[model samples]
Target: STGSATTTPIDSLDDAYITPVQIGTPAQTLNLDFDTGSSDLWVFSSETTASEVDGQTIYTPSKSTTAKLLSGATWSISYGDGSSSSGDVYTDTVSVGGLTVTGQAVESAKKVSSSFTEDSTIDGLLGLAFSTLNTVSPTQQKTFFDNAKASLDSPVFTADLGYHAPGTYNFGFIDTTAYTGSITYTAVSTKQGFWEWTSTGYAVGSGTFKSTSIDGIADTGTTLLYLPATVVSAYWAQVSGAKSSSSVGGYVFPCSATLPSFTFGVGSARIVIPGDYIDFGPISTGSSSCFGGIQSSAGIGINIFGDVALKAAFVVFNGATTPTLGFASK
Candidate 1:
């Protein structure tokens, strides 16, 4: 069995990617942020405070006959960015594209942070990280992908996130036509509950490929590429007048500056992110200074290969007993 679905970027900056998911018997459809960095399938629901329900859709469990309450079960989770959501749990029929799973735990939000409520495009989040990171108390639940693996032809899934465009997320088998060249396989350590891997090295545009192994997580939910201060400084040093601005809150440069492309290696194959992609956008409307998509992960403690880098290549999240990751150019 296999399933395929398209994920659409909600903002011009490609801040987050969303996929439509159906819940319960009557099938209340909601756009969910597919977060590979966390493990918890949560959604805005009838339980969410009315004041917090801006323009986003809310899932009503009462309307669905298949909805079953997981009595006394509660869950709470916060992100690295400070946004958070917490709620009670329910089990119901869940579907994405053509795949379906029964008795899937759906965390119905009783409370949500202002950051999430302000974002009208996203109704909830569908977590793809390891189940060990699940926040449910008493008994943690498996993710949609983890529960669906037994029925899939292979216990794997892939993310083909695009820039200001629609991308595909495929479950079970890989789409051979989706990528070019052979996929470079790498080991993934689930100890951290993320799709963590090591890059063979990196090069600043057409410069030399400094052979230094860099460890990072492939987080589709994150908007920018965050690396070590040394690597981030090396990239900005190439751009004229680029500086870290406390006022702007990140590395910024003239919008008119000629930018250089970024390349990072997965084994021997190097994935290149075009220069234009590095120019995130202006710090403010009509501002002359622009923010750089590549920023330092110094304070975050771990490097994150976010949408800026994930959009450059085809990424496979292999969920086998020995969990591995595969990357290829598109």
Candidate 2:
């Protein structure tokens, strides 16, 4: 259920800028969030006063040499963390990897939270995951890709996240060098940007569990891998001295032991979560350790396959011809 894109190196956090091109002309170098969970590029604008925006870098359209605003339309976004931001709409030039796109529709938020207003790190988020989840409305006009697709070297945008130090994220053309084998393609469902899949079953150590299959979606927007209660418990059973504590809301196993690897089967495609991922130390005052591989999100409507899963394979999101997701070796 994982989708992939290539990574490009940025000198500073601000260097992670992309040029938005349109109608055969270069527009502007706008900062993007290289996010895998959701697809859509958004930036802050001049109308966004410091009071409304929070711990995020804001892009004042007036400050940019090339920028424009969309009249009459409004936009709002609510994150899973309860943090939210809202504002009006605008169209501007954005650049990424030397590719310029023009007249790209972006949400310019006027009211934001402290998290985005107080901090100055990266300006805004540039979603590179899937276009189905785009926040731009048809009445408002085109998305970043909607206008730039014809000019792009490839109609698809690829993201490659670095596994080691000097880690980077790349956009634009897909790098064929990363994969060792042929890429396997899967047709994406028409539903939003959610990549849905049927699990074959869970696996512990080297053995596969023959139990009821689980259904879920792979989301890059999330940071952790969420699983059903039954499947999560079965995984904890394999770890020696593994115990469940109420504090952490899930089972925590000793990180010192040789933890077992878990595999999630997406039809014939098997995605393995290594033991190391199971050692997410307690982020809170709780006594239970957070297992990176499998944590309990039992009742949540969607189960996410996050960045952890992307680290294990090469995923390709195809929006050029038909909306589809392709997977291969990284």
Candidate 3:
């Protein structure tokens, strides 16, 4: 009823996480970034152009006896960060941990964005978002999670996105051992095809929790925490040297500045992101100016609770009922 996989961090970046997944009859294994922001089980494969494919481990559909082409099917996906991928489709037996989804529509990328082509560490992405967000032509594709849910004890998964350390992605049931205290739940709105929810309020440093209702998403793929300018400005104001700089991008602050912690309210549950994580290190290599990982989501339209916010706690993404998010301190 329950299965778990080791979520490995993407090198030293701590920006994303990947888990091993198996596809086909004999099982062609690939490491996939478990992304909740988008829906698609795409992989760098034989279909990828020779010039585009780097050192990534590619999946060869012909090598799998169970692989079957989904005739005339294709997929295209674009991320807010500008990364994209387009590919043809095939049906295969996909397995993650002990959970398996037979005849899963696996997208084999024929083309990809520069970001994806450059990222040699990740083979592809295993989207955990709602099926409505899936990208495919002719017919939409259901994510591996969606197909395997029926066999799970509860149609839910938990993300323990760790900082600089390997975390985990648990399927079917929430593991009480992974978190502390009571799990507080919040209502989620999936109309936008995302795990969008409202933040009851938030605080800068030790400041009082402001009564501001902010609608945002819990995106595992995004590297930084992006909030509205209203919230971002207030947080930066607390750091004496922090200022908006186009050159450095977003809000750049002195590396030596004593950063303040950020906290957001999910009903009664408080997710407090530590100061160090907000620093996000330097803006660029060898640059003295450090960019705040917490930036403005103005252009993006929605605040994103990415790695900077998610790594602070254990997150439960419920798909069985009203689609509420359960949060608990790690």
Candidate 4:
């Protein structure tokens, strides 16, 4: 049997997607964001500090008889965006779609940054990346996908993230109906806990195809696409008046600016991101300036093909042997 679930976008902000999961004996439901970039299944819990708990729906293990403490086990995570969370651990039954995993480690957040506390909608995060990146102490934890993989018909999962629209995260088996054309496969080096792949090169709006290598991650948690400083500068140079806005803290241009199409080469297939998606939404409530969806991944060291870039194609995260990435145009 195939395991599948739909992922709903939180808002038009193109922020993230949420999936429903049952967490206890009788099943306490929580909406979690599936993140392929990081590996830690954590949630806002009753153990969280009262001051830190804002409007989020916290999970209370005391109410669940099936919940078991992991003694001295603990977990802490810090995001590249500066957001962070740390918490204690518990073992419980967690179910996603129709698949159930017994004795899965669930981290309950005791501390969170302003970002997590301020976001009232998301109750937790479901890790989809490699389990080697798990941050739990004493012994690292396994993700829900890992625990249930043995029972799955296949080890692969497809991420169909959309723009302001609902998409599906299909597990165990791939659904051919969801995408058009053949899926283009690429080698994925997940040695660092990310779906890491290199783009052959890029071109700006019908320009000459440049041949080079740009390695980066396919991260669903990240909202924007990242590239090198030189590549970013070259792309912006074509757009008149589009300058790196220090005030906005990113590359920006007039809101009405007619943007050019940008394309990335994956193997031999070229995936193009339209101008509409390139101009990230407005920076301020009432400003003529708009932030760019593509920026330099200078300090981050590695480039990232975030939601903006991923939206252009239907992605397949193949976990067969070496964990490959397959892409098909949307």
Candidate 3, position 38, lDDT: 87
What is the alpha-carbon lDDT of model 4 when measured against the actual structure? 0.87
Highest lDDT: give the candidate number.
Answer: 1
Residue 296 of model 4, lDDT score: 91
Put down candidate 1 lDDT per residue, 1-330, tens digits, no spaces.
888999999988888999999999889999999999998999999999999999999999999999999999999999999999999999999998889999999999999999999999999999999999999998999999999999999999999998779999999999999999999999999989999999988889889988998999999889999999999999999999999998878899999998999999998889999888887788989999999999999999999999999999999999999999999999
Report, for every candidate in turn, its global Cα lDDT versus the true structure.
0.94, 0.58, 0.89, 0.87
lDDT at 122 for candidate 4? 89
Task: Estimate the TM-score of every prediction.
Answer: 0.99, 0.77, 0.97, 0.96
Q: For this target, which candidate reaches the highest TM-score against the unseen true structure?
A: 1
CA deviation > 4 Å runs, candidate 3: none
Tens-digit lDDT track of model 4 for 64-105: 889999999999999889999999999999888877889999
Q: Which stretches of candidate 4 lie over 4 Å from their true place?
A: none
- Full ranking by TM-score: 1, 3, 4, 2
Residue runs of model 2 more than 4 Å from their true location after superposition: 1-31, 51-56, 114-122, 129-133, 136-142, 164-172, 209-214, 241-246, 249-251, 255-257, 285-293
Candidate 1 colliding pairs: none
**Tens digits of per-residue lDDT for model 2, 88-108:** 766666655455556666677
lDDT of 3 by residue, 1-330 (tens): 777899988877687788999999899999999888889999999989989998999999999999999999999988898888998999999888888888999999999989888888899999988999998989998988888888899999999988889898999998899998989988999998889999888998999989788899999988899998989999999998899998766899998898999999988779899898787777788887887888999888788999899999899999876888989998
- Better-scoring candidate (lDDT), 2 or 3: 3
